[PDB]
Amino acid sequence: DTIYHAKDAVQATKPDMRKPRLVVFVVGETARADHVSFNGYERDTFPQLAKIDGVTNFSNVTSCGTSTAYSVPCMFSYLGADEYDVDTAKYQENVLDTLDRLGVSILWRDNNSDSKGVMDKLPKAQFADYKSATNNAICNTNPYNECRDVGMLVGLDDFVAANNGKDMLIMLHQMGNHGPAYFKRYDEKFAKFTPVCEGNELAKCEHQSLINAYDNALLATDDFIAQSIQWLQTHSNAYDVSMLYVSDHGESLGENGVYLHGMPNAFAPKEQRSVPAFFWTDKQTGITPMATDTVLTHDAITPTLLKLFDVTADKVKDRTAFIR
Amino acid sequence: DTIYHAKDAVQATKPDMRKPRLVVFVVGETARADHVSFNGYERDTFPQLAKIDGVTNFSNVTSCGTSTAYSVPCMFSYLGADEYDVDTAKYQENVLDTLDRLGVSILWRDNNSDSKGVMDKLPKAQFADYKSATNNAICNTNPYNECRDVGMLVGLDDFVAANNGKDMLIMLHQMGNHGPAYFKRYDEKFAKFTPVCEGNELAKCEHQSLINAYDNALLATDDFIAQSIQWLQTHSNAYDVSMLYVSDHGESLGENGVYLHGMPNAFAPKEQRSVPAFFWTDKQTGITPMATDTVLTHDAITPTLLKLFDVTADKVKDRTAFIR
Numbered sequence: 001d002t003i004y005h006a007k008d009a010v011q012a013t014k015p016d017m018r019k020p021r022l023v024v025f026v027v028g029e030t031a032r033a034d035h036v037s038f039n040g041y042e043r044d045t046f047p048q049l050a051k052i053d054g055v056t057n058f059s060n061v062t063s064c065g066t067s068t069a070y071s072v073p074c075m076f077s078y079l080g081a082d083e084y085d086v087d088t089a090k091y092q093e094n095v096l097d098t099l100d101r102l103g104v105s106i107l108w109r110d111n112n113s114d115s116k117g118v119m120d121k122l123p124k125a126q127f128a129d130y131k132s133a134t135n136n137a138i139c140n141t142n143p144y145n146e147c148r149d150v151g152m153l154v155g156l157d158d159f160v161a162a163n164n165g166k167d168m169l170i171m172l173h174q175m176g177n178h179g180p181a182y183f184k185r186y187d188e189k190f191a192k193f194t195p196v197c198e199g200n201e202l203a204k205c206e207h208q209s210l211i212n213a214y215d216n217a218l219l220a221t222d223d224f225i226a227q228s229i230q231w232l233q234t235h236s237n238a239y240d241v242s243m244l245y246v247s248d249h250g251e252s253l254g255e256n257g258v259y260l261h262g263m264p265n266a267f268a269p270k271e272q273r274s275v276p277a278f279f280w281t282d283k284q285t286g287i288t289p290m291a292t293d294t295v296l297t298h299d300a301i302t303p304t305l306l307k308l309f310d311v312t313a314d315k316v317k318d319r320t321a322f323i324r
Numbered sequence: 325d326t327i328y329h330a331k332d333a334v335q336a337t338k339p340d341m342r343k344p345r346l347v348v349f350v351v352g353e354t355a356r357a358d359h360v361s362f363n364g365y366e367r368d369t370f371p372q373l374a375k376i377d378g379v380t381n382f383s384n385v386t387s388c389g390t391s392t393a394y395s396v397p398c399m400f401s402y403l404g405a406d407e408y409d410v411d412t413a414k415y416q417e418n419v420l421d422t423l424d425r426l427g428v429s430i431l432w433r434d435n436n437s438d439s440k441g442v443m444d445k446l447p448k449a450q451f452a453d454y455k456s457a458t459n460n461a462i463c464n465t466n467p468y469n470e471c472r473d474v475g476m477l478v479g480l481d482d483f484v485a486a487n488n489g490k491d492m493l494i495m496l497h498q499m500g501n502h503g504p505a506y507f508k509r510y511d512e513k514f515a516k517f518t519p520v521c522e523g524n525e526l527a528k529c530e531h532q533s534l535i536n537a538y539d540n541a542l543l544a545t546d547d548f549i550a551q552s553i554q555w556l557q558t559h560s561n562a563y564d565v566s567m568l569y570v571s572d573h574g575e576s577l578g579e580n581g582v583y584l585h586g587m588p589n590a591f592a593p594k595e596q597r598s599v600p601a602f603f604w605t606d607k608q609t610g611i612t613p614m615a616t617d618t619v620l621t622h623d624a625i626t627p628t629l630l631k632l633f634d635v636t637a638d639k640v641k642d643r644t645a646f647i648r
């Protein structure tokens with residue numbers, strides 16, 4: 001019952017005749033553009049990414065919607081935000097379907113929830129649940145026994161070896177800044193801003209303590225993205241490596257009494273849709289980022305992923321991406 | 325070849341058993357929300373509407389697009405901005421088709437261009453060109469021989485008499501703030517802000533002189549809307565009278581070197597889509613406006629027009645309008 005959108009897609013060069021390409025796409029969670037240092041926030045919430053050459057920050061990115069179930073399938077859609085509908089997304093060919101058909105090896109590790117239908121047509125072995133300590137080795141580093149996003153990097157070299165010489169796209173779906181318990185989202189080495197709200201009744205938190213917990217969780221995501229780049233750099237001789245980060249949606253933090261996310265796009269405050277995006281690539285790859293102030297949305301993700309693998313598809317041929 | 329959307333529409337009460345309803349919808353042109361006094365502009369650009377009881381200003385209205393051809397059909401569409409497509413709008417049943425089928429008498433006078441397909445299924449006599457001095461009696465009041473929006477009010481009592489006792493919806497498509505020659509858009513009694521730019525090469529205008537011409541054209545629209553209300557008030561004993569105003573799109577005035585409108589929504593600056601909207605009703609009508617800060621778009625127009633005539637249609641049943 002698949003409705004196709006890119007049966008014409010062609011890959012202009014193959015990994016038997018040029019370097020294979022290895023990309024990590026971090027599918028972020030709950031992060032707000034306006035809490036990113038690079039976008040003008042008053043605090044340095046991304047100190048480690050600031051030191052990495054080759055990172056581009058995008059200051060004007062709007063998510064497709066305000067929730068995981070709405071945004072995540074739209075991020076991988078061909079249809080764009082206007083014609084995307086959540087009710088039928090599962091039956092559309094999505095960009096991972098196309099890349100898999102073209103021979104890219106797809107992996108999805110999830111420390112959040114699940115792929116919201118995006119992985120459903122691909123073999124079940126290509127999806128792995130990293131919220132569970134059965135699979136994630138990094139869960140006892142905090143009082144909540146919460147498995148951490150950095151645990152998704154453990155053992156990726158085995159996936160690379162099993163796909164030796166092929167193009168690869170790895171999605172890491174992070175827990176990130178999920179609320180309401182922002183204080184649970186980061187280990188103690190990131191407990192920089194204090195005091196913190198440590199209750200789930202957010203309207204009873206002092207506003208600054210809630211912001212402080214949220215910003216500490218951002219520091220842990222800065223760390224996770226930095227470690228994902230460092231992992232890619234261990235493969236940059238054999239593979240052309242790049243990393244894309246985009247959050248699924250933002251978050252309200254008490255403005256006008258609004259908390260969490262999920263508001264319909266018709267009425268949602270801007271904080272629920274203004275999201276960070278970062279793109280990193282190694283110097284060898286020939287990939288050129290777009291200008292930092294390009295007006296961008298989740299609709300740029302599908303053409304970016306196709307372009308990273310040298311794929312053209314008529315449906316998105318002239319659509320703006322995060323890269324040229 | 326009509327694609328229907330509201331074949332279920334029903335009118336809950338008819339003008340043989342309650343007062344007939346008479347509405348003017350001013351389809352505006354090029355006006356920016358941020359140049360409206362009520363929205364926080366630094367100048368009083370709407371002094372006459374300020375004095376009329378029963379006017380509601382809406383501070384958060386976003387147009388469907390940035391041009392006449394895109395926005396005008398969307399304003400009367402059932403589909404909403406996301407699923408609206410300009411290429412097939414002409415074949416969809418629109419809200420005027422539904423209201424005409426239900427017995428509302430539709431009139432469209434145009435001092436701008438045309439209805440962009442919206443009137444095309446209705447008899448040609450229901451559309452009248454008021455850009456021409458053959459039909460518009462008010463064109464020699466300025467050095468440009470430009471026919472004025474207030475000329476569209478002349479002789480409306482004859483339309484009311486020919487439709488005596490029926491519900492009526494009159495669209496007045498104004499020239500408004502059309503550029504680039506903003507200085508041509510208003511007669512001398514509105515030449516309040518000076519000096520003015522009087523050239524069509526906008527980037528050579530001093531910025532303040534360009535703003536001054538634009539704001540003088542707003543004063544003439546304040547006057548035209550006030551006179552449209554005053555006209556309605558001459559019929560408020562026999563008819564339940566109301567007036568809706570919404571602009572088709574905004575305008576760039578030199579911000580970052582951008583002038584005029586028409587930018588694709590993907591990249592358009594906010595000034596091209598943030599538009600004023602006003603709603604007036606007489607005290608007798610029982611119509612209640614929404615809160616001034618309701619998040620609104622052109623998608624609110626179709627349910628507003630249906631609600632004004634006591635019509636329900638499943639497709640827009642729970643869609644937010646400018647009124648309850």
Ligand SMILES: OC[C@@H](O)[C@@H](O)[C@H](O)[C@@H](O)CO
Pocket residue numbers: 064065066067069070261262263264265266
């Ligand atoms: O515009 C839809 C919005 O982005 C989305 O968050 C929904 O409100 C939510 O998915 C409903 O559960």
Ligand SMILES: OC[C@@H](O)[C@@H](O)[C@H](O)[C@@H](O)CO
Pocket residue numbers: 388389390391393394585586587588589590
């Ligand atoms: O998003 C479309 C935009 O609103 C519209 O103004 C078009 O750019 C124009 O109609 C093209 O001519």
Ligand SMILES: [Zn+2]
Pocket residue numbers: 044047
């Ligand atoms: Zn710092």
Ligand SMILES: [Zn+2]
Pocket residue numbers: 029030067068248249
């Ligand atoms: Zn989320």
Ligand SMILES: [Zn+2]
Pocket residue numbers: 068112113178
């Ligand atoms: Zn969740």
Ligand SMILES: [Zn+2]
Pocket residue numbers: none
């Ligand atoms: Zn949830």
Ligand SMILES: [Zn+2]
Pocket residue numbers: 081082083084085086406
């Ligand atoms: Zn949709």
Ligand SMILES: [Zn+2]
Pocket residue numbers: 085407
């Ligand atoms: Zn739909």
Ligand SMILES: [Zn+2]
Pocket residue numbers: 085
């Ligand atoms: Zn729908």
Ligand SMILES: [Zn+2]
Pocket residue numbers: 085087
């Ligand atoms: Zn649907």
Ligand SMILES: [Zn+2]
Pocket residue numbers: 100103104105106
């Ligand atoms: Zn494969």
Ligand SMILES: [Zn+2]
Pocket residue numbers: 188189
């Ligand atoms: Zn410590």
Ligand SMILES: [Zn+2]
Pocket residue numbers: 368371
């Ligand atoms: Zn005044």
Ligand SMILES: [Zn+2]
Pocket residue numbers: 353354391392572573
């Ligand atoms: Zn226009």
Ligand SMILES: [Zn+2]
Pocket residue numbers: 392436437502
């Ligand atoms: Zn025009």
Ligand SMILES: [Zn+2]
Pocket residue numbers: none
């Ligand atoms: Zn034009």
